[PDB]
Design a binder for these strands. Structure first.
Ligand SMILES: Nc1ncnc2c1ncn2[C@H]1C[C@H](O)[C@@H](COP(=O)(O)NP(=O)(O)OP(=O)(O)O)O1
Ligand SMILES: [Mg+2]
Ligand SMILES: [Mg+2]
Length: 55
DNA sequence: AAACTATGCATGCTCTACTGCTTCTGATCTAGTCGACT
């Protein structure tokens, strides 16, 4: 599709047991970036947000 | 010798603290129902 309403991403790791708590860490890092306007929650394995992309 | 006064004591009353037991109340964890989303 050349258009849409959101960007859907999936995060995975080649190892088995490593994928334990990636999403909270990435979420916190992005929040520290200063791009998240809304967060679903503000252990989890899913979250939809509203990024602030530069324009 | 008799009348008045003095001390002395006891017991019930009141208050304030103190400790320990019992009951009531406020803070903290989950089932169900409705709704949101991918
Ligand atoms: N009710 C549902 N049931 C099963 N899978 C679903 C679903 N709703 C979404 N998915 C799954 C399948 C969907 O492909 C995937 C993406 O969800 P979106 O971002 O909400 N819808 P899309 O990306 O297709 O349209 P756009 O490009 O405009 O955003 O999530
Ligand atoms: Mg989508
Ligand atoms: Mg989506």
């Amino acid at each position: 599709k050349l258009q849409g309403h959101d960007v859907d991403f999936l995060i995975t790791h080649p190892k088995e047991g490593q994928e334990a708590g990636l999403l909270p860490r990435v979420m916190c890092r992005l929040q520290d970036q200063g791009l998240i306007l809304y967060h679903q929650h503000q252990a989890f394995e899913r979250s939809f947000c509203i990024f602030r992309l530069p324009q």
